[PDB]
Amino acid sequence: KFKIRPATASDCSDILRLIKELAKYEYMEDQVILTEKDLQEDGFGEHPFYHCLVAEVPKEHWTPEGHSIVGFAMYYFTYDPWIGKLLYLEDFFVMSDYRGFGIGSEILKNLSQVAMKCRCSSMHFLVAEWNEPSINFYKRRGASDLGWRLFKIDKEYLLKMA
Amino acid sequence: KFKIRPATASDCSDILRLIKELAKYEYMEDQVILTEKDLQEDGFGEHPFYHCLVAEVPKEHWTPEGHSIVGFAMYYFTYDPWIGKLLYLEDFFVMSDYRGFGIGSEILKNLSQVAMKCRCSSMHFLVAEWNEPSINFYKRRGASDLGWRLFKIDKEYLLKMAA
Ligand SMILES: CC(C)(COP(=O)(O)OP(=O)(O)OC[C@H]1O[C@@H](n2cnc3c(N)ncnc32)[C@H](O)[C@@H]1OP(=O)(O)O)[C@@H](O)C(=O)NCCC(=O)NCCS
Numbered sequence A: 001k002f003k004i005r006p007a008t009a010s011d012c013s014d015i016l017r018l019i020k021e022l023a024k025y026e027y028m029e030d031q032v033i034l035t036e037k038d039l040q041e042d043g044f045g046e047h048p049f050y051h052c053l054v055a056e057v058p059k060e061h062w063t064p065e066g067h068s069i070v071g072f073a074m075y076y077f078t079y080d081p082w083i084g085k086l087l088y089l090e091d092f093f094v095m096s097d098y099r100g101f102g103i104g105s106e107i108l109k110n111l112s113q114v115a116m117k118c119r120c121s122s123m124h125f126l127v128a129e130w131n132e133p134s135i136n137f138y139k140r141r142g143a144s145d146l147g148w149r150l151f152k153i154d155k156e157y158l159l160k161m162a
Numbered sequence B: 001k002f003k004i005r006p007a008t009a010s011d012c013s014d015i016l017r018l019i020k021e022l023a024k025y026e027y028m029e030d031q032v033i034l035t036e037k038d039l040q041e042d043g044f045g046e047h048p049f050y051h052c053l054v055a056e057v058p059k060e061h062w063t064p065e066g067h068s069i070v071g072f073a074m075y076y077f078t079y080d081p082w083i084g085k086l087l088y089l090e091d092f093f094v095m096s097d098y099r100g101f102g103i104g105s106e107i108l109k110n111l112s113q114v115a116m117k118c119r120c121s122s123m124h125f126l127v128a129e130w131n132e133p134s135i136n137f138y139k140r141r142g143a144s145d146l147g148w149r150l151f152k153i154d155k156e157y158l159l160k161m162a163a
């Protein structure tokens, strides 16, 4: 019905499409500046900066536009000074017409295996307070709630400090 | 006076000490379940899960207990699906007796050099919202302030799903 597997270079175009689809639930699609080239260069070179799992369905189940990828998860490893290695889930999305069949659960299942393989102590991720569905989805699977502010110094200034 | 250089498996004992001295300010130096072994394996094994810059002072300026490492920065690369790779500064600390001389600024110049090398579009990090001097310390360096809820799925549960 569907296969959850590691992403490949040729999946990048599908990954970009879903990232954007995910940005429509935030009403900021125009905010995505990454291209298929950036994704290939950043995820499939010598040193990947991210890792991806995708959901591929059979031909008689592709989208009308002809896409074979209907879901994905983007993640990377982070480190915590107190407990160590963590698996950080950055994005997680399943297209509308492909929800309810267990794709999301299968993806989380593969993410858990990647985590145990990493010897990671936990998997962390963000969830919008207003997206109850995703909340109840994660809660039923062991997730639990976990005063600082995120600052940013752009290249502009970084280059100056250098 | 001082020198900032990348860490080595040898400095892990000192990195741990600084991690704990920082946690002390919150009386939570017992929350640190990490040991020198972990930092060495996680940091200098086949795959580095973090990177550290240490501040080293000459024997003339060692500490009462005789340590040459008076500060560090722990970082790793992250990714944002909208803009790309970022350099994420996880921890940044300098022993109290040693701040004010320019060690932190030196560490930031190096992190900046790493960010330019990675060709990272930005460096993210957490700042205590209530901390005014800190905020401005960063705002003076080009820093600018940026309803989500942080969740975690611990090991027990990950093991359930993975089997
Ligand atoms: C949360 C999300 C990422 C998980 O992906 P998914 O592929 O659908 O995942 P799964 O197929 O394994 O099932 C997830 C859930 O949908 C719920 N579900 C399945 N069929 C459903 C239906 N017909 N009506 C309402 N909920 C339903 C399930 O109860 C299940 O959560 P639970 O096992 O913790 O009770 C995705 O469902 C989503 O973006 N949801 C937003 C809200 C929405 O589309 N509603 C869910 C209807 S299926």
Ligand SMILES: CC(C)(COP(=O)(O)OP(=O)(O)OC[C@H]1O[C@@H](n2cnc3c(N)ncnc32)[C@H](O)[C@@H]1OP(=O)(O)O)[C@@H](O)C(=O)NCCC(=O)NCCS
Pocket (backbone or CB within 6 Å): B025, B091, B092, B093, B094, B095, B098, B099, B100, B101, B102, B103, B104, B105, B106, B136, B137, B140
């Ligand atoms: C934040 C921190 C890392 C900065 O490092 P540091 O060693 O103090 O770094 P610096 O000495 O370069 O601090 C810069 C300041 O010291 C003084 N300073 C630095 N070099 C100087 C020089 N050559 N001449 C005169 N003053 C100087 C200045 O007032 C200067 O502030 P400015 O650069 O905005 O004008 C350090 O204060 C610390 O570890 N924080 C406190 C511990 C804590 O609770 N925080 C950790 C959470 S991140």
